[PDB]
Design a protein around this ligand. Structure first.
Ligand SMILES: [Zn+2]
Length: 173
């Protein structure tokens, strides 16, 4: 719950991974910030990377299918650094079975995920993983927060914020 984690730049309540063991897993890999994913997939040169990325589970969807099996879930991720950039992580079969009860607000490491086929109508980056071990639970995002201001009207502002970097959102300074 105090000072920052080297790789994600977030401070984590009750960390789950040795400092050493992080450098170990991180070794020889490329750190790609979540915001850089869209372009690397578009320019079609993400595959050739042995890459790692970091997100906070901002939201969990556990929608409908049972199509032939078979339940799955979706996580909305944000790095609390580019508060505008989000990606969606699809968990299927093994991976769902294994991680789907993870608490929202958990910071995760995501390694060498697979881009989903792009769906008409979206601006959206979606990825899945062929293996439970591609998702590294690192602990709680102690700074996941909301703009402290009030919507110049009534109601409190609802904009997402990094409580350790800034307490107000972009639109209130
Ligand atoms: Zn605000």
């Amino acid at each position: 719950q105090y000072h920052v984690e080297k790789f994600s730049g977030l401070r984590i309540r009750k960390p789950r991974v040795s400092s050493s063991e992080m450098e170990r897993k991180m070794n020889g890999r490329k750190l790609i910030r979540l915001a850089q994913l869209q372009n690397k997939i578009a320019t079609e040169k993400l595959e050739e990377e042995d890459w790692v990325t970091f997100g906070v589970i901002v939201k969990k969807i556990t929608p409908q299918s049972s199509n032939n099996g078979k339940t799955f879930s979706i996580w909305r991720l944000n790095d609390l650094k580019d508060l505008d950039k989000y990606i969606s992580l699809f968990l299927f079969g093994d991976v769902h079975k294994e991680h789907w009860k993870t608490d929202q607000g958990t910071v995760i490491g995501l390694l060498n995920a697979n881009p989903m086929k792009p769906k008409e109508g979206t601006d959206e980056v979606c990825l899945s993983v062929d293996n439970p071990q591609k998702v590294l639970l690192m602990g709680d995002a102690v700074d996941l927060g909301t703009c402290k201001a009030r919507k110049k009207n009534g109601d409190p502002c609802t904009q997402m914020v990094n409580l350790n970097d800034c307490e107000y959102c972009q639109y209130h300074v």
